[PDB]
């Protein structure tokens, strides 16, 4: 897990940049039945995708893997049906806390150079404030259509104390902030990954969740804190 066959390249989503095609192979696009992209997600193995609960995914939507340019027909993409949706029961529609949903596919994704899994952390992993990580997706590049090509951005993790100086009590323990650094997640990025590179491998630290209603690049983005939710993830996989 967490080792793209095609190496991402970063300069070191608003004010992001274009991904090397295929370089974030756990990234999926969640599309409705009329074909519109509404959220992102991440492959965590060949049968399961993790995304955000507020994305409201149903068995009518589909998971699209292996995609780079949504305006292109030259990509060998996989249009994967969803067998069942598992929204975290503790998801709070009020505070957007515990913002995570698992999707079990009707048929397994076929892993390839351009399609493979991100690593998941253990509940006790520590991803230090100030760590430079990466987020990706097809959300808007300016706060109106979503961009055709996959975007990426590097951005620093914030401490929750420092994140609270912007957002106050809206920040819960099951959230982690990142950004306020010249880039911003934006509409259509939800449910996609925030990854940090731990031990030569990319690990899912955050799920794109919420932030500035205008995708301001000077305020922190907020992400579902995967370490706080990964025990629920493992129990859901085990039981279903």
């Amino acid at each position: 897990c967490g080792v793209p066959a095609i190496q991402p390249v970063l300069s070191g989503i608003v004010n992001g940049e274009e991904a090397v095609p295929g370089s974030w192979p756990w990234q999926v696009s969640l599309q409705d039945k009329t074909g519109f992209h509404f959220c992102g997600g991440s492959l965590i193995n060949e049968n399961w995708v993790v995304t955000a609960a507020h994305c409201g995914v149903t068995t009518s939507d589909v998971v699209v893997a292996g995609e780079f340019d949504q305006g292109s027909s030259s990509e060998k993409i996989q249009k994967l049906k969803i067998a069942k949706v598992f929204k975290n029961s503790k998801y709070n529609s009020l505070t957007i806390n515990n913002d995570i949903t698992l999707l079990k596919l009707s048929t397994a994704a076929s892993f390839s150079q351009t399609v493979s899994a991100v690593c998941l952390p253990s509940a006790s992993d520590d991803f230090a404030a100030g760590t430079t990580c990466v987020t990706t997706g097809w959300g808007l590049t300016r706060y109106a259509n979503t961009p055709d090509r996959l975007q990426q951005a590097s951005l620093p993790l914030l401490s929750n104390t420092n994140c609270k100086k912007y957002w106050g009590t809206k920040i819960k323990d099951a959230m982690i902030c990142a950004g306020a650094s010249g880039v911003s997640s934006c509409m259509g990025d939800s449910g996609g990954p925030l990854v940090c590179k731990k031990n030569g491998a990319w690990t899912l630290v955050g799920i794109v969740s919420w932030g500035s209603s205008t995708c301001s690049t000077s305020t922190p983005g907020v992400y579902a804190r995967v370490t706080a939710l990964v025990n629920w993830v493992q129990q859901t996989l085990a039981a279903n």
Binding site: F36, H54, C55, I96, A144, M187, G188, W210, G211, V222
Partner: protein
């Protein structure tokens, strides 16, 4: 007076086309909703927005 509520995108990072009733302009109008914390002035279709305001 639900149509008098303002366009609210909310803070979620979803891409959800919707329609709202613009007072200034007096029309039903398309906007990108983020997926959470929306208010009443938020409809799935233009027909649906018009068929309850106008």
């Amino acid at each position: 007076s639900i149509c008098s509520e303002p366009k609210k995108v909310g803070r979620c990072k979803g891409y959800f086309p919707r329609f709202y009733f613009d007072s200034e302009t007096g029309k039903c109008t398309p906007f990108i909703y983020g997926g959470c914390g929306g208010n009443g002035n938020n409809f799935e279709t233009l027909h649906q927005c018009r068929a309850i305001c106008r």
